Amino acid sequence: GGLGLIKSLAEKEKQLLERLEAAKKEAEERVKRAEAEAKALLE
Amino acid sequence: IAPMEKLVLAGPKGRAKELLQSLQQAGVVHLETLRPEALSAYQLSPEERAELRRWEAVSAGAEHTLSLLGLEAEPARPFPEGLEAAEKALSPIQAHAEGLTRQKQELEEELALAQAYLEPLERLAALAHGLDKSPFLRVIPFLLTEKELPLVEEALRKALEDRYLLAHEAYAGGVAALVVVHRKEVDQAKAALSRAGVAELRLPGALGELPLSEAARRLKERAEAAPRELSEVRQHLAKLARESASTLQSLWTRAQDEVARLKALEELASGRFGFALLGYVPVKAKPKVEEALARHKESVVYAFEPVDEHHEADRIPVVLDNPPWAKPFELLVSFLNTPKYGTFDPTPVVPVFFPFWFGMIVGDIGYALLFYLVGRWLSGYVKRNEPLVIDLFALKLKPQVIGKLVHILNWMVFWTVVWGVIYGEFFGTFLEHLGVFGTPEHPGLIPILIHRIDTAKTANLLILLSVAFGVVLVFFGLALRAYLGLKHRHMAHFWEGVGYLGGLVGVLALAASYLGNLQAGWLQGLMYLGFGVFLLAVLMSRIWLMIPEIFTQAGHILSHIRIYAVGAAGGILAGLLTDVGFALAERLGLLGVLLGLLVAGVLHLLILLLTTLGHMLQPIRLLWVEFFTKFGFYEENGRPYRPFKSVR
């Protein structure tokens, strides 16, 4: 029903956005490791 | 009354856009906002807002182009194309029509302004053909009044008397009082003459802004050129309208559909790349809604949830849901507001009683035959499938409403001819010639149940029939109100209806006991129980719905005798007119029966056109005043079932 769709859409956007930002934080870690390897190879 | 269940769907944003286009194609469901909880307001896009503004501007330009073309907004099949190509097609015809209309309006104004001062400027130029623009003399010309030239020549005598050539030659529509002396002294004398009342011929454009002979030549050229130009402009405008009206109508239909989809997208609810829609739809369209949802992208969740209960149904829509035998009275039923979606649909009692009361109102069989002739005329007009157009009435009616009116007129005229056979009256009193009714005063044919002329044996029975019909309608309305109060579990209105019924019953019993006949033993406990039930419901309510309310309900019950009153009045009028006509025709000469019958038919048609509107309106007004108001029917006015349009 209507309120069921309200609750479901709220949970949808909550869990999908939380997965999105979790993956971008792991992307941040990948960027950090990549420049660490870059500077280690240059030195 | 329909069930009107709740219908919901969901999906992604553009998926909801496609499904909303599909739901606008099968527009059998009204929507709802439900913006409040745990979602966005679904402000779609600024690009979507700009595209909606562009399509709305295209629709407004198409409407203005149809208005300038003179055609009306008639719906048709849409034109499926892109917005840019449709705008490019619309703008060409709109620009051509706008330039043609501007040129036509300017040429008509120029022709009118030239004709307003055509001959007088020519006469003044012929009089002043020696000093037109000479640099020594200004010539104040004035289209002045009648032959009072000394009144304006007093200022010329106040100027140099043997100077200042000042006269009015001809063209008596306005006397061309031209005064020519100089520049400065003539300007002072022109100010003095305007103080005496004068005005220089300074027209707009260039004719009142150029030298006199050149402006005369240009005005003569415009007068010789304007009519063929206006005729060719009207011809080219008619050709452009006849060549572009169908394309403009299809573009207006497609633009109205796109603007409807754009405005309906505003009522959506966004879920951060998620969307849903909720609304109402009738239970008889669940298969149509399922077939519309069959074309969904992933067969989205068509939640056919139930409607609300007897309480808390406020934004729920409303529909008729009546029998097809009673489908024609829908316009008369919907002339008022809507019910409370759980209120009693009273449309069936309208076809049950308004025809039965209306036949008792009008009992003229000749008027029924004239109504059959007018209904055959309206049926031929509806079979021609043209819109019913009445310019002095400003009444434009579709063929469905005209067909419903014809069906209601037939259903009225059947019982009307039945009651006219019961009244024994055909076109007034045609029985004065051939006694189709059988009276004991003069037996001509089979006997009439009602002679409808005398009231010594008729008035008491007619008043009793009207009172019984009104009491039955009042009791049915009170019972319907009590049943609706029991259904809604609101015991205030239920106790009010039960007490009103008991008070009306006790009032009728005590009236028939005291002011009526003898034998006051059987109804004595009836009147006592009625007064006791009235007092007990007043104690159980304590709402101060006092004896004024009971007297108003009793007057609404007793007002049903107006039907018999109007029927007797119309019968007496028609019988008097027909008797006077037949007497002055046959008994006075028996040879002016042609002219006498023509004058009698003219007077009968005049009396019919004068009284039949009120005679037909009084029964429906009494029905709307009794059956609605006794059952309430004046609470919150309902909410309308407005689905997606697809206006076509």
Short mmCIF file of N, CA, C and O in Angstrom, two decimals, chain B residues 28-148:
data_model
loop_
_atom_site.label_atom_id
_atom_site.label_comp_id
_atom_site.label_asym_id
_atom_site.label_seq_id
_atom_site.Cartn_x
_atom_site.Cartn_y
_atom_site.Cartn_z
N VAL B 28 -7.96 6.08 -16.51
CA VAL B 28 -9.15 5.64 -15.79
C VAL B 28 -8.94 5.69 -14.27
O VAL B 28 -9.69 5.08 -13.53
N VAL B 29 -7.92 6.41 -13.81
CA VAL B 29 -7.59 6.46 -12.39
C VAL B 29 -7.18 7.87 -12.02
O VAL B 29 -6.39 8.50 -12.72
N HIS B 30 -7.72 8.37 -10.91
CA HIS B 30 -7.27 9.64 -10.36
C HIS B 30 -6.06 9.41 -9.46
O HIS B 30 -5.89 8.34 -8.87
N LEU B 31 -5.24 10.44 -9.34
CA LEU B 31 -3.99 10.34 -8.60
C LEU B 31 -4.12 10.94 -7.21
O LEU B 31 -5.18 11.41 -6.80
N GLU B 32 -3.01 10.93 -6.47
CA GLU B 32 -2.92 11.51 -5.14
C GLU B 32 -1.47 11.87 -4.87
O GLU B 32 -0.56 11.26 -5.43
N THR B 33 -1.27 12.87 -4.02
CA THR B 33 0.08 13.39 -3.80
C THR B 33 0.91 12.48 -2.90
O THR B 33 1.91 11.92 -3.34
N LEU B 34 0.48 12.34 -1.63
CA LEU B 34 1.16 11.55 -0.59
C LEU B 34 2.62 11.97 -0.39
O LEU B 34 3.49 11.16 -0.08
N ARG B 35 2.88 13.27 -0.57
CA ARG B 35 4.19 13.89 -0.49
C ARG B 35 4.81 13.81 0.90
O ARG B 35 6.03 13.93 1.03
N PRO B 36 3.99 13.63 1.95
CA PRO B 36 4.42 13.95 3.32
C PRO B 36 5.58 13.15 3.90
O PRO B 36 6.56 13.74 4.36
N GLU B 37 5.50 11.82 3.89
CA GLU B 37 6.38 11.00 4.70
C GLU B 37 7.51 10.39 3.88
O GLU B 37 7.27 9.80 2.82
N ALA B 38 8.75 10.59 4.36
CA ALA B 38 9.95 9.80 4.03
C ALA B 38 10.29 9.79 2.54
O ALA B 38 10.92 8.83 2.06
N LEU B 39 9.90 10.81 1.79
CA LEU B 39 10.20 10.88 0.37
C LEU B 39 10.48 12.33 0.00
O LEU B 39 10.39 13.24 0.82
N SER B 40 10.84 12.53 -1.26
CA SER B 40 11.07 13.87 -1.78
C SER B 40 9.77 14.43 -2.36
O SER B 40 8.76 13.74 -2.50
N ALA B 41 9.81 15.72 -2.70
CA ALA B 41 8.66 16.38 -3.30
C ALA B 41 8.54 16.12 -4.80
O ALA B 41 7.55 16.57 -5.40
N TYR B 42 9.51 15.41 -5.38
CA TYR B 42 9.58 15.09 -6.81
C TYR B 42 9.56 16.35 -7.68
O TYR B 42 8.83 16.44 -8.67
N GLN B 43 10.36 17.33 -7.29
CA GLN B 43 10.75 18.36 -8.24
C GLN B 43 11.64 17.67 -9.26
O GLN B 43 12.80 17.36 -8.95
N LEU B 44 11.10 17.40 -10.45
CA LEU B 44 11.68 16.47 -11.41
C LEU B 44 13.05 16.91 -11.91
O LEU B 44 14.06 16.25 -11.63
N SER B 45 13.10 18.03 -12.62
CA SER B 45 14.35 18.60 -13.11
C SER B 45 14.13 20.05 -13.48
O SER B 45 13.00 20.44 -13.81
N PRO B 46 15.17 20.88 -13.43
CA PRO B 46 15.05 22.20 -14.06
C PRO B 46 14.95 22.10 -15.57
O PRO B 46 14.28 22.92 -16.20
N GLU B 47 15.60 21.09 -16.16
CA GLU B 47 15.45 20.83 -17.58
C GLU B 47 14.04 20.35 -17.91
O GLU B 47 13.46 20.75 -18.93
N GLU B 48 13.47 19.50 -17.05
CA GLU B 48 12.09 19.09 -17.23
C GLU B 48 11.12 20.25 -17.03
O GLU B 48 10.12 20.34 -17.74
N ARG B 49 11.44 21.16 -16.11
CA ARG B 49 10.61 22.35 -15.91
C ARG B 49 10.68 23.27 -17.12
O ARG B 49 9.66 23.83 -17.54
N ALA B 50 11.87 23.41 -17.71
CA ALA B 50 12.01 24.25 -18.90
C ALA B 50 11.32 23.63 -20.10
O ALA B 50 10.71 24.34 -20.91
N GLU B 51 11.40 22.30 -20.24
CA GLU B 51 10.70 21.62 -21.33
C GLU B 51 9.19 21.69 -21.15
O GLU B 51 8.46 21.82 -22.14
N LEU B 52 8.71 21.62 -19.91
CA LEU B 52 7.29 21.77 -19.64
C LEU B 52 6.83 23.19 -19.94
O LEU B 52 5.74 23.39 -20.49
N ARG B 53 7.65 24.19 -19.61
CA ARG B 53 7.34 25.57 -19.95
C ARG B 53 7.34 25.78 -21.45
O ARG B 53 6.52 26.53 -21.98
N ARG B 54 8.23 25.08 -22.16
CA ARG B 54 8.28 25.19 -23.62
C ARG B 54 7.05 24.57 -24.26
O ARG B 54 6.46 25.15 -25.18
N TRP B 55 6.64 23.39 -23.78
CA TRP B 55 5.44 22.76 -24.31
C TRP B 55 4.18 23.55 -23.95
O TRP B 55 3.25 23.63 -24.76
N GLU B 56 4.16 24.16 -22.76
CA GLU B 56 3.02 24.99 -22.38
C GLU B 56 2.96 26.26 -23.21
O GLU B 56 1.88 26.72 -23.57
N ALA B 57 4.13 26.83 -23.54
CA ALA B 57 4.16 27.98 -24.43
C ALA B 57 3.74 27.61 -25.84
O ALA B 57 3.10 28.41 -26.52
N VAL B 58 4.08 26.39 -26.28
CA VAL B 58 3.64 25.91 -27.58
C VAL B 58 2.12 25.75 -27.60
O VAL B 58 1.46 26.11 -28.58
N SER B 59 1.56 25.23 -26.50
CA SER B 59 0.11 25.07 -26.41
C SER B 59 -0.60 26.42 -26.35
O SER B 59 -1.65 26.60 -26.97
N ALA B 60 -0.02 27.38 -25.63
CA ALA B 60 -0.62 28.71 -25.54
C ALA B 60 -0.53 29.44 -26.88
O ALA B 60 -1.48 30.14 -27.27
N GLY B 61 0.58 29.28 -27.59
CA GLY B 61 0.69 29.85 -28.92
C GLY B 61 -0.25 29.22 -29.92
O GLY B 61 -0.79 29.90 -30.78
N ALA B 62 -0.48 27.91 -29.79
CA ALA B 62 -1.45 27.24 -30.65
C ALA B 62 -2.87 27.71 -30.35
O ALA B 62 -3.68 27.88 -31.26
N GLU B 63 -3.17 27.93 -29.06
CA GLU B 63 -4.49 28.44 -28.69
C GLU B 63 -4.69 29.86 -29.19
O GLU B 63 -5.77 30.19 -29.69
N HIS B 64 -3.66 30.70 -29.08
CA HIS B 64 -3.76 32.06 -29.60
C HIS B 64 -3.83 32.09 -31.12
O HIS B 64 -4.52 32.94 -31.69
N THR B 65 -3.17 31.14 -31.78
CA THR B 65 -3.24 31.06 -33.24
C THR B 65 -4.61 30.59 -33.70
O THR B 65 -5.12 31.06 -34.72
N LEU B 66 -5.22 29.66 -32.95
CA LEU B 66 -6.58 29.25 -33.26
C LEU B 66 -7.58 30.36 -32.97
O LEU B 66 -8.60 30.48 -33.66
N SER B 67 -7.30 31.18 -31.95
CA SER B 67 -8.17 32.31 -31.64
C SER B 67 -8.09 33.38 -32.73
O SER B 67 -9.11 33.94 -33.13
N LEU B 68 -6.88 33.67 -33.20
CA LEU B 68 -6.72 34.62 -34.30
C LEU B 68 -7.25 34.06 -35.61
O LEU B 68 -7.70 34.82 -36.47
N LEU B 69 -7.21 32.73 -35.77
CA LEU B 69 -7.77 32.10 -36.96
C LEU B 69 -9.29 32.07 -36.93
O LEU B 69 -9.91 31.85 -37.98
N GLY B 70 -9.90 32.29 -35.77
CA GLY B 70 -11.33 32.24 -35.63
C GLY B 70 -11.90 30.88 -35.30
O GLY B 70 -13.06 30.80 -34.89
N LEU B 71 -11.12 29.82 -35.48
CA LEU B 71 -11.59 28.48 -35.15
C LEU B 71 -11.63 28.29 -33.64
O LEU B 71 -11.01 29.03 -32.87
N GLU B 72 -12.38 27.27 -33.21
CA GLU B 72 -12.53 26.95 -31.80
C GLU B 72 -11.64 25.77 -31.42
O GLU B 72 -11.10 25.07 -32.28
N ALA B 73 -11.50 25.57 -30.12
CA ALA B 73 -10.64 24.51 -29.59
C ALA B 73 -11.38 23.19 -29.67
O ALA B 73 -11.96 22.71 -28.69
N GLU B 74 -11.36 22.59 -30.85
CA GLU B 74 -12.00 21.29 -30.96
C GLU B 74 -10.97 20.18 -30.82
O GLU B 74 -9.93 20.21 -31.47
N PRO B 75 -11.24 19.19 -29.96
CA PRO B 75 -10.27 18.11 -29.77
C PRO B 75 -10.31 17.12 -30.93
O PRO B 75 -11.33 16.93 -31.59
N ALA B 76 -9.16 16.50 -31.17
CA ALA B 76 -9.00 15.53 -32.25
C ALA B 76 -7.82 14.62 -31.89
O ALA B 76 -7.33 14.64 -30.76
N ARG B 77 -7.37 13.84 -32.86
CA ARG B 77 -6.23 12.97 -32.62
C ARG B 77 -4.94 13.80 -32.58
O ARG B 77 -4.82 14.79 -33.30
N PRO B 78 -3.98 13.41 -31.76
CA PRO B 78 -2.76 14.21 -31.58
C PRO B 78 -1.81 14.04 -32.76
O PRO B 78 -2.00 13.21 -33.64
N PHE B 79 -0.76 14.85 -32.75
CA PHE B 79 0.29 14.79 -33.77
C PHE B 79 1.58 14.33 -33.12
O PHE B 79 2.28 15.15 -32.49
N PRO B 80 1.94 13.05 -33.22
CA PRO B 80 3.13 12.55 -32.53
C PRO B 80 4.40 12.92 -33.28
O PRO B 80 4.68 12.39 -34.36
N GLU B 81 5.18 13.82 -32.70
CA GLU B 81 6.45 14.27 -33.27
C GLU B 81 7.29 14.87 -32.15
O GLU B 81 6.90 14.86 -30.98
N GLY B 82 8.45 15.39 -32.52
CA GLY B 82 9.29 16.09 -31.57
C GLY B 82 8.76 17.48 -31.28
O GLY B 82 7.90 18.02 -31.98
N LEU B 83 9.28 18.07 -30.20
CA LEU B 83 8.84 19.40 -29.80
C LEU B 83 9.37 20.47 -30.75
O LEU B 83 8.68 21.45 -31.04
N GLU B 84 10.59 20.28 -31.26
CA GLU B 84 11.21 21.29 -32.11
C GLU B 84 10.55 21.36 -33.48
O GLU B 84 10.30 22.45 -34.00
N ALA B 85 10.26 20.20 -34.08
CA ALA B 85 9.61 20.19 -35.39
C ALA B 85 8.18 20.69 -35.31
O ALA B 85 7.70 21.38 -36.21
N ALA B 86 7.48 20.36 -34.21
CA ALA B 86 6.13 20.87 -34.01
C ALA B 86 6.14 22.38 -33.78
O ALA B 86 5.26 23.09 -34.28
N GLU B 87 7.15 22.89 -33.07
CA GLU B 87 7.27 24.33 -32.88
C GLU B 87 7.59 25.04 -34.19
O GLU B 87 7.07 26.12 -34.47
N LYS B 88 8.44 24.42 -35.02
CA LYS B 88 8.78 25.01 -36.32
C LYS B 88 7.59 24.99 -37.27
O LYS B 88 7.42 25.91 -38.07
N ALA B 89 6.76 23.95 -37.18
CA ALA B 89 5.55 23.92 -38.00
C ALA B 89 4.52 24.92 -37.50
O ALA B 89 3.80 25.53 -38.30
N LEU B 90 4.43 25.10 -36.18
CA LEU B 90 3.43 25.99 -35.62
C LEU B 90 3.78 27.45 -35.86
O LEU B 90 2.90 28.26 -36.16
N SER B 91 5.06 27.80 -35.73
CA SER B 91 5.52 29.18 -35.79
C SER B 91 5.35 29.78 -37.18
O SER B 91 5.16 30.99 -37.31
N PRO B 92 5.43 28.96 -38.24
CA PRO B 92 5.26 29.50 -39.60
C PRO B 92 3.84 29.98 -39.86
O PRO B 92 3.62 31.11 -40.32
N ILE B 93 2.87 29.12 -39.55
CA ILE B 93 1.47 29.46 -39.73
C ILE B 93 1.06 30.57 -38.77
O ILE B 93 0.28 31.46 -39.13
N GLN B 94 1.60 30.54 -37.55
CA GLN B 94 1.29 31.58 -36.57
C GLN B 94 1.85 32.92 -36.99
O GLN B 94 1.18 33.95 -36.84
N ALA B 95 3.05 32.93 -37.57
CA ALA B 95 3.65 34.18 -38.02
C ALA B 95 2.92 34.73 -39.24
O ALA B 95 2.69 35.94 -39.34
N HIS B 96 2.53 33.85 -40.17
CA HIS B 96 1.78 34.28 -41.34
C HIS B 96 0.41 34.84 -40.95
O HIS B 96 0.00 35.90 -41.45
N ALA B 97 -0.28 34.16 -40.04
CA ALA B 97 -1.58 34.63 -39.58
C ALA B 97 -1.47 35.90 -38.76
O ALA B 97 -2.34 36.77 -38.85
N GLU B 98 -0.39 36.05 -37.98
CA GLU B 98 -0.21 37.26 -37.19
C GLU B 98 0.09 38.46 -38.07
O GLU B 98 -0.46 39.54 -37.86
N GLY B 99 0.93 38.27 -39.09
CA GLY B 99 1.20 39.35 -40.03
C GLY B 99 -0.02 39.71 -40.85
O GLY B 99 -0.28 40.89 -41.09
N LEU B 100 -0.80 38.70 -41.26
CA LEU B 100 -2.03 38.96 -42.00
C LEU B 100 -3.06 39.69 -41.14
O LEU B 100 -3.71 40.63 -41.62
N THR B 101 -3.19 39.30 -39.87
CA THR B 101 -4.15 39.95 -38.99
C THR B 101 -3.73 41.37 -38.64
O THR B 101 -4.58 42.26 -38.55
N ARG B 102 -2.43 41.60 -38.45
CA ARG B 102 -1.94 42.94 -38.18
C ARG B 102 -2.13 43.85 -39.38
O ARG B 102 -2.57 45.00 -39.24
N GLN B 103 -1.83 43.34 -40.59
CA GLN B 103 -2.03 44.11 -41.81
C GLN B 103 -3.51 44.39 -42.04
O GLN B 103 -3.87 45.49 -42.47
N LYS B 104 -4.38 43.43 -41.72
CA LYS B 104 -5.81 43.61 -41.92
C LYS B 104 -6.39 44.62 -40.94
O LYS B 104 -7.21 45.47 -41.32
N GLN B 105 -5.96 44.56 -39.67
CA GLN B 105 -6.43 45.52 -38.68
C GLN B 105 -5.93 46.93 -38.99
O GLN B 105 -6.69 47.90 -38.87
N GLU B 106 -4.67 47.05 -39.42
CA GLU B 106 -4.12 48.35 -39.77
C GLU B 106 -4.80 48.92 -41.02
O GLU B 106 -5.09 50.12 -41.07
N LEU B 107 -5.09 48.06 -42.00
CA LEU B 107 -5.76 48.53 -43.21
C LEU B 107 -7.21 48.91 -42.95
O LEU B 107 -7.71 49.88 -43.54
N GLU B 108 -7.89 48.18 -42.06
CA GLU B 108 -9.26 48.54 -41.70
C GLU B 108 -9.31 49.85 -40.93
O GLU B 108 -10.18 50.69 -41.18
N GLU B 109 -8.36 50.05 -40.01
CA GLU B 109 -8.28 51.31 -39.28
C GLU B 109 -7.93 52.46 -40.21
O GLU B 109 -8.47 53.57 -40.07
N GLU B 110 -7.06 52.21 -41.19
CA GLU B 110 -6.69 53.25 -42.15
C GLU B 110 -7.86 53.61 -43.06
O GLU B 110 -8.07 54.78 -43.36
N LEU B 111 -8.63 52.60 -43.49
CA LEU B 111 -9.79 52.86 -44.33
C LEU B 111 -10.87 53.61 -43.56
O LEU B 111 -11.51 54.52 -44.10
N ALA B 112 -11.06 53.27 -42.28
CA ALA B 112 -12.05 53.97 -41.46
C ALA B 112 -11.63 55.41 -41.20
O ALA B 112 -12.45 56.33 -41.29
N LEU B 113 -10.34 55.64 -40.90
CA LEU B 113 -9.86 56.99 -40.66
C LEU B 113 -9.83 57.83 -41.93
O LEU B 113 -10.00 59.05 -41.86
N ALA B 114 -9.64 57.20 -43.09
CA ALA B 114 -9.72 57.93 -44.35
C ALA B 114 -11.16 58.29 -44.68
O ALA B 114 -11.44 59.41 -45.12
N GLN B 115 -12.10 57.35 -44.45
CA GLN B 115 -13.50 57.62 -44.73
C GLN B 115 -14.12 58.60 -43.74
O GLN B 115 -15.13 59.23 -44.07
N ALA B 116 -13.53 58.75 -42.55
CA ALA B 116 -14.06 59.70 -41.58
C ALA B 116 -13.87 61.15 -42.00
O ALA B 116 -14.66 62.00 -41.59
N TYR B 117 -12.86 61.45 -42.81
CA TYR B 117 -12.59 62.82 -43.23
C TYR B 117 -12.20 62.88 -44.70
O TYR B 117 -11.27 63.58 -45.09
N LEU B 118 -12.91 62.13 -45.54
CA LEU B 118 -12.53 62.02 -46.95
C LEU B 118 -12.89 63.26 -47.74
O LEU B 118 -12.01 63.95 -48.28
N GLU B 119 -14.18 63.57 -47.84
CA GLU B 119 -14.68 64.65 -48.68
C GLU B 119 -14.34 66.01 -48.09
O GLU B 119 -14.11 66.97 -48.84
N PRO B 120 -14.32 66.14 -46.76
CA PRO B 120 -14.06 67.46 -46.17
C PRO B 120 -12.63 67.92 -46.35
O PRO B 120 -12.39 69.12 -46.57
N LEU B 121 -11.66 67.00 -46.27
CA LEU B 121 -10.28 67.35 -46.55
C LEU B 121 -10.09 67.75 -48.01
O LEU B 121 -9.34 68.68 -48.31
N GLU B 122 -10.81 67.08 -48.92
CA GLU B 122 -10.75 67.44 -50.33
C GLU B 122 -11.35 68.81 -50.58
O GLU B 122 -10.79 69.61 -51.35
N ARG B 123 -12.47 69.13 -49.93
CA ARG B 123 -13.09 70.44 -50.10
C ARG B 123 -12.23 71.54 -49.50
O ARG B 123 -12.10 72.63 -50.09
N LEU B 124 -11.62 71.28 -48.34
CA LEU B 124 -10.75 72.28 -47.73
C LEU B 124 -9.47 72.48 -48.53
O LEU B 124 -8.95 73.60 -48.59
N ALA B 125 -8.95 71.42 -49.16
CA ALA B 125 -7.78 71.57 -50.01
C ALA B 125 -8.11 72.31 -51.30
O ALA B 125 -7.29 73.08 -51.81
N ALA B 126 -9.31 72.08 -51.84
CA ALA B 126 -9.74 72.81 -53.02
C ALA B 126 -9.98 74.28 -52.71
O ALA B 126 -9.74 75.14 -53.56
N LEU B 127 -10.46 74.58 -51.50
CA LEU B 127 -10.61 75.97 -51.10
C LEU B 127 -9.26 76.62 -50.84
O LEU B 127 -9.05 77.79 -51.18
N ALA B 128 -8.32 75.88 -50.25
CA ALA B 128 -7.01 76.39 -49.87
C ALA B 128 -5.91 75.93 -50.81
O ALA B 128 -4.80 75.61 -50.38
N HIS B 129 -6.19 75.89 -52.11
CA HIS B 129 -5.23 75.41 -53.09
C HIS B 129 -4.24 76.48 -53.54
O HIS B 129 -3.46 76.22 -54.46
N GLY B 130 -4.25 77.65 -52.92
CA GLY B 130 -3.30 78.69 -53.28
C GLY B 130 -2.22 78.89 -52.24
O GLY B 130 -1.05 79.11 -52.58
N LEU B 131 -2.60 78.80 -50.97
CA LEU B 131 -1.64 78.84 -49.86
C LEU B 131 -1.86 77.57 -49.05
O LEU B 131 -2.59 77.56 -48.06
N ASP B 132 -1.21 76.48 -49.48
CA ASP B 132 -1.29 75.23 -48.74
C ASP B 132 -0.15 75.11 -47.75
O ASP B 132 -0.36 74.78 -46.57
N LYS B 133 1.08 75.37 -48.20
CA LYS B 133 2.26 75.35 -47.35
C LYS B 133 3.14 76.55 -47.65
O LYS B 133 4.37 76.46 -47.62
N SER B 134 2.52 77.69 -47.97
CA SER B 134 3.28 78.90 -48.21
C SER B 134 3.82 79.44 -46.89
O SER B 134 3.13 79.39 -45.87
N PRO B 135 5.05 79.97 -46.88
CA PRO B 135 5.64 80.40 -45.60
C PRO B 135 5.25 81.81 -45.18
O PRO B 135 6.10 82.59 -44.74
N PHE B 136 3.97 82.15 -45.32
CA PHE B 136 3.45 83.41 -44.82
C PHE B 136 2.09 83.28 -44.14
O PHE B 136 1.66 84.24 -43.50
N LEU B 137 1.42 82.14 -44.25
CA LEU B 137 0.03 82.02 -43.83
C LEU B 137 -0.25 80.60 -43.39
O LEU B 137 -0.15 79.67 -44.20
N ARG B 138 -0.61 80.42 -42.12
CA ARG B 138 -1.13 79.15 -41.65
C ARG B 138 -2.65 79.15 -41.77
O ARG B 138 -3.32 80.14 -41.45
N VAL B 139 -3.19 78.02 -42.22
CA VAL B 139 -4.62 77.89 -42.50
C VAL B 139 -5.18 76.93 -41.47
O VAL B 139 -5.09 75.70 -41.63
N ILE B 140 -5.77 77.47 -40.41
CA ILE B 140 -6.45 76.66 -39.41
C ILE B 140 -7.75 76.16 -40.01
O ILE B 140 -8.70 76.94 -40.19
N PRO B 141 -7.83 74.88 -40.39
CA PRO B 141 -9.12 74.32 -40.82
C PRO B 141 -9.81 73.61 -39.68
O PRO B 141 -9.17 72.92 -38.88
N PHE B 142 -11.13 73.76 -39.59
CA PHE B 142 -11.90 73.16 -38.50
C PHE B 142 -13.17 72.57 -39.08
O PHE B 142 -13.95 73.28 -39.72
N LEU B 143 -13.38 71.27 -38.86
CA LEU B 143 -14.67 70.67 -39.17
C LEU B 143 -15.66 71.06 -38.09
O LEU B 143 -15.88 70.31 -37.14
N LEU B 144 -16.25 72.25 -38.22
CA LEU B 144 -17.05 72.85 -37.17
C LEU B 144 -18.54 72.62 -37.43
O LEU B 144 -18.93 71.94 -38.39
N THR B 145 -19.36 73.24 -36.59
CA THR B 145 -20.79 72.98 -36.49
C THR B 145 -21.58 73.66 -37.61
O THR B 145 -21.01 74.09 -38.61
N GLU B 146 -22.89 73.77 -37.42
CA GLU B 146 -23.80 74.26 -38.45
C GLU B 146 -23.64 75.77 -38.64
O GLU B 146 -22.72 76.41 -38.11
N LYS B 147 -24.57 76.37 -39.39
CA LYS B 147 -24.40 77.73 -39.91
C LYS B 147 -24.50 78.79 -38.82
O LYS B 147 -25.47 79.55 -38.76
N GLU B 148 -23.49 78.84 -37.95
CA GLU B 148 -23.28 79.89 -36.97
C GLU B 148 -21.91 80.51 -37.19
O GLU B 148 -21.12 80.67 -36.25
#
